[PDB]
Amino acid sequence: ELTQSRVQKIWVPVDHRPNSPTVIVMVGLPARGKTYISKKLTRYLNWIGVPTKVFNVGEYRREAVKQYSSYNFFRPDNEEAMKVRKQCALAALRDVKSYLAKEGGQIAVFDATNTTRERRHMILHFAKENDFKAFFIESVCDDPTVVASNIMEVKISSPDYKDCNSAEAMDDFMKRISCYEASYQPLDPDKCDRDLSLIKVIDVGRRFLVNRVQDHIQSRIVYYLMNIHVQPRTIYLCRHGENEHNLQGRIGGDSGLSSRGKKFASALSKFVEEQNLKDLRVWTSQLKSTIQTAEALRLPYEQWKALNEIDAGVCEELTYEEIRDTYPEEYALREQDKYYYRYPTGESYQDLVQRLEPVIMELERQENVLVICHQAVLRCLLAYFLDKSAEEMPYLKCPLHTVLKLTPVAYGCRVESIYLNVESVCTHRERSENPLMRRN
Amino acid sequence: ELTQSRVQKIWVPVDHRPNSPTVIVMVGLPARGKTYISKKLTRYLNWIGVPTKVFNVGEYRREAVKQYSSYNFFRPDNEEAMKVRKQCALAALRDVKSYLAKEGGQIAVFDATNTTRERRHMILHFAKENDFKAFFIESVCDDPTVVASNIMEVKISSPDYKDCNSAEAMDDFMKRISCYEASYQPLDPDKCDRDLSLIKVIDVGRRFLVNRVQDHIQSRIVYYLMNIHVQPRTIYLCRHGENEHNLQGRIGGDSGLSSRGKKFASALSKFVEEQNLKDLRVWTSQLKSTIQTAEALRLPYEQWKALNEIDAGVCEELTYEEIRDTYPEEYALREQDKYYYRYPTGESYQDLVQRLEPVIMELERQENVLVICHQAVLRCLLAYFLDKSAEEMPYLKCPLHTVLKLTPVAYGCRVESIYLNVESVCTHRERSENPLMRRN
Ligand SMILES: Nc1ncnc2c1ncn2[C@@H]1O[C@H](COP(=O)(O)OP(=O)(O)O)[C@@H](O)[C@H]1O
Ligand SMILES: Nc1ncnc2c1ncn2[C@@H]1O[C@H](COP(=O)(O)OP(=O)(O)O)[C@@H](O)[C@H]1O
Ligand SMILES: O=P(O)(O)OC[C@H]1O[C@@](CO)(OP(=O)(O)O)[C@@H](O)[C@@H]1O
Ligand SMILES: O=P(O)(O)OC[C@H]1O[C@@](CO)(OP(=O)(O)O)[C@@H](O)[C@@H]1O
Ligand SMILES: O=P(O)(O)OC[C@H]1O[C@](O)(CO)[C@@H](O)[C@@H]1O
Ligand SMILES: O=P(O)(O)OC[C@H]1O[C@](O)(CO)[C@@H](O)[C@@H]1O
């Protein structure tokens, strides 16, 4: 007969009491970007609501072996270490099983060189017997400058190399790489790996070989992998300059900038100029206050409906007081479950994620971008860049008049905050703190 | 200082008076799906708002050569026909130039075998000198059953074979294919075509080789190409059973089914059963009336916010009369420009396109799907399947209680309409038909 759920506003059938998880398998020599792709891809998947976890076999190794000493550990003749490495893989797999079949996880990224047919064949056997789909991602790169640079960026400052300097860490890791070169069997989609679902990423994403995509979530991953790059650049995020409803503690609406909001706009101009960016895309919402802010910059800017602020449904243009008083039950429900709560005839943070994915996907393709937007929206994008969970995302602090400047480092993003020194109200609201439903 | 445009509600700077177009190049032997990919890809691009046109060199040929007689026309020794074919290509290119540089077009799909380096090299020269990006799409398929089947489906009933039967049309076309086999040079991304942007579609999309995507619109095309298939299936589209606001001529809202809407639901059940589909996905919106309708079917169904009806902003739940009276100017603006018009704090048909693209993209991946939805939404999806322009889309007829059953045939979709014989109101509104602003 159907009832409308109170938080999400989803119609469900009144309950009057009387698909397959995926193991993603990274493949390739060390320092080929496997961990980087693993973390980044996991970041994306979790943010769009597909629960995903990285199993880095190296971290299992570091847990079972106290202190690393040298590449001798990795030699093919090292029978004891081969026993430990195998056991490390199997222990990681056990966890994958646990995570896909008992913990709610949907994708497990199995992050190891997985460079032999023998190793892949085993992983397949394990997928098969657990009823997991398997998908392979191989990074192929024999440009020595790339390999070298990669080693400098992430390898030499690993815990393996703690009591150790650059030149010898670098030298050791080059020998660890040679250990794997002898029996490395790349994916052969053309005959032997004919039936595997895989993508082979070649020359830092200059080229792809894609073979048998088998489902919604695989085709997404491929799309994503083909749009990210590693060129250096900067993402700036901030809100529209202070607006008039800000001044009255009113949510939503389409009000213009306060005189302070305008002073922020000029400062943002000054800030942009001093950053000395050769090019810079500017994006705004379609709400006036982000566009007026962009106008202060005298640069081409592009408006996106998707960046419009969360839609507060029938609460548009009310104060939170007015909300508490007219809709106390709604007000309380939003406080209980702020990520999933949807306003009546309006949206939840969950909805924002879904409209923002194409913004994120274009952010990934671009180089320098300034995105001028709104509180909830900004939280949602920041959660993606800083890997914040659904549960922390509605509460991230995203004040007015402040640029978040995001630069890629190692495996994620450095955030620097830069306030442009123009006052405004503060619209941040922290989380909020029953005897008579019990006998005592 | 900024003013809000009256139709689209876009903030633009008050005007107080004082990138590169793409040529897509199809590559491959005849009957490899080139025209099919060309038309389908064009259909997609236009619907998402990227203006795109197919230039089929064969149609130029049919215009310059009166009546086709046989494959002798295509022989490599046929010097006169080689002059005509070349001139046909160049004339198509002239049109491409005209379309990209003078007509507003953004993508031109150059649809010919384009099987030699010499031919591609020329096309490149032409792109270069006109400042067009160039992107190549090659279909490789040497499965004789596929080639044969393809010839049966689209070739034998071409105007070339008018006074001609199956067996000899088929025989002639196999020889036309052999004409091209001798100097066919496939794209070699591995050395000679190292610098071309291309995708090589292999074995009906079992496998892809992608090389140097260079922009937003290229990566989209690839994503799209990797999600379409050619397996036989059926798409059903219909509206929620009649609802209560329907009965009062009220737009929007979230009202439940009338007793007739419920009788439709049962009939839809009966209809689904008699279709005898081995599997069938069912999708609804998150509005009650589509979900109640799906409940009548007793099948798993999945709710999509993106399928929710167009949002009429501050007109939600008004009658069109109430709209005319309270917002005559809005009412008139919507009549002037119904595709682009956006309701205040609500949406336009343009917005629906953009929320619906992921629905379309998943429709392309699926097999049997029934989508139960709403008037404007249904128009938008139908426009994509039946290739209708922006301008005709807001006016397509999508009555209550009627299934549109879409089956792939040749180069697009057959539509059959099936009414389930339960009365309802009719919510269709046709298009609507100044001396005092002039001296006489
Ligand atoms: N497709 C790629 N090919 C080569 N290097 C890459 C790729 N993607 C990212 N990288 C680089 O790899 C480095 C991280 O290496 P890591 O992911 O730890 O390698 P691995 O896990 O293969 O040992 C980063 O410097 C990043 O720029
Ligand atoms: N990737 C593909 N490989 C082979 N055949 C395909 C592919 N995609 C579509 N087809 C089939 O091609 C047929 C249409 O052929 P057409 O597009 O006119 O070929 P061409 O233009 O290469 O002569 C349809 O039957 C369709 O099923
Ligand atoms: O199981 P194999 O194929 O050895 O790969 C796991 C090993 O890969 C290594 C090799 O570098 O990766 P990582 O850089 O991920 O720490 C080892 O640390 C880890 O023990
Ligand atoms: O310029 P080329 O490479 O000959 O390709 C154009 C020719 O391709 C053909 C070969 O079949 O395609 P179509 O099937 O598109 O009509 C000819 O009709 C057309 O004249
Ligand atoms: O989810 P929160 O914390 O209530 O913040 C969202 C609000 O912030 C604003 O951008 C300005 O306060 C409102 O328009 C929006 O409703
Ligand atoms: O664009 P149109 O022709 O006004 O039709 C859209 C309307 O149709 C309905 O689905 C029902 O009439 C309304 O909810 C919606 O506003």
Curated annotation (Swiss-Prot), chains A, B:
One BP term from GO: motor behavior
Signal sequence, start to end: none
Gene Ontology CC annotations of this record: cytosol; nucleoplasm
Keywords: ATP-binding, Hydrolase, Kinase, Multifunctional enzyme, Nucleotide-binding, Phosphoprotein, Transferase
SUPFAM superfamilies in the cross-refs: P-loop containing nucleoside triphosphate hydrolases (SSF52540), Phosphoglycerate mutase-like (SSF53254)
Active site residues of this protein: D111, C141, H240 (tele-phosphohistidine intermediate), E309 (proton donor/acceptor)
Site (Transition state stabilizer): R239, N246, H374
InterPro entries: 6Pfruct_kin, 6Phosfructo_kin, His_Pase_superF_clade-1, His_PPase_superfam, P-loop_NTPase, PG/BPGM_mutase_AS
Entry's Gene Ontology molecular function annotations: 6-phosphofructo-2-kinase activity; ATP binding; fructose-2,6-bisphosphate 2-phosphatase activity
Record PROSITE patterns: PG_MUTASE
Ranges where the record places region Fructose-2,6-bisphosphatase: 232-440
Region (6-phosphofructo-2-kinase): 1-231
Highest rank taxon of the organism: Eukaryota
Xref: CDD domains: HP_PGM_like
Residues holding ATP: 28-36, 150-155, 331-334, 375-379, 411
Post-translational modification: Phosphorylation by AMPK stimulates activity.
List of residues binding beta-D-fructose 6-phosphate: R61, R85, T113, R119, K155, R176, Y180
Function: Catalyzes both the synthesis and degradation of fructose 2,6-bisphosphate.
UniProt similarity note: In the C-terminal section; belongs to the phosphoglycerate mutase family.
The protein's assembly and partners: Homodimer. Forms a heterodimer with PFKFB2.
Protein name in the entry: 6-phosphofructo-2-kinase/fructose-2,6-bisphosphatase 3
Organism listed in the record: Homo sapiens
